[PDB]
UniProtKB/Swiss-Prot annotation, chains A, E, F:
The chain holds residues 680 to 692 of 770 of the full protein. This is Amyloid-beta protein 40. It comes from the Eukaryota. It is found in: Cell surface. Cu(2+) 2 binds at Y2, H5, H6. The record marks K8, L9, F11, F12 as: Cleavage. Interacts with S100A9. Glycans are attached at Y2. Zn(2+) 2 binds at Y2, H5, H6.
Length: 13, 35, 35, 35, 13, 13, 31, 31, 31, 17, 17, 17
């Protein structure tokens, strides 16, 4: 199998 | 068998977190003061 | 068998986090002061 | 068998994080002062 | 399998 | 398999 | 007006010998 | 007005001999 | 007026002999 | 004698012993 | 004698012993 | 005698012993 670990952060200012 | 540890953390801090701004700290870990 | 440690962290800090801006720190780890 | 350690970190700091701007630090790790 | 680990950060200012 | 590890940072100012 | 002050210390008074001291006054530590 | 101040320390008074001291006043440490 | 101040330290008073001191006042350390 | 791990003060990090 | 790990103060990092 | 690792103060880095 596949063990994908991601995480994002989108910031507008 | 086999060990497996995963750890994800996402941290977002605002203007001044944990800040000693304008404070007056006097700290003494051991030592001797004879005033 | 087999060990496996994964670790992801994403950190975002704002203007002045954990800063001693304008503070007066007096610190002493051991030592002797005879005033 | 086989060990495996992965480590990803993405850090973003704003204007002055952890700065002693304008501070007055007096620090003493050991030593002797006879005033 | 495949073990993909990514992470993004998009910032507008 | 393939073990791809990437990470981006896009910043507009 | 008289005055006097005697101080006698024996050994290791206020000592940190053998200690593991992690200290932090402000600042940032990541991992 | 008289005055006096005697101080007698013997050994390791206020000493750090053998200690592991990690100290931080401001600043940043990554990993 | 009079005044006096005697100080007698014997050995290792306030010393760091054998210590491992990592110190930081501002600045940046990456890895 | 020891083949494990002995730690005094630990802040993050990975020890595999 | 030791074939493990002995650490005093550790901030991050990887030790495999 | 030791074939492990002995560290005093460690900030990041990799030790494989």
């Amino acid at each position: 199998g596949y063990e994908v670990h991601h995480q994002k952060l989108v910031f507008f200012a | 068998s086999g060990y497996e540890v995963h750890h994800q953390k996402l941290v977002f801090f605002a203007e001044d977190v944990g800040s000693n701004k304008g404070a007056i700290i006097g700290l003494m870990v051991g030592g001797v003061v004879i005033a």
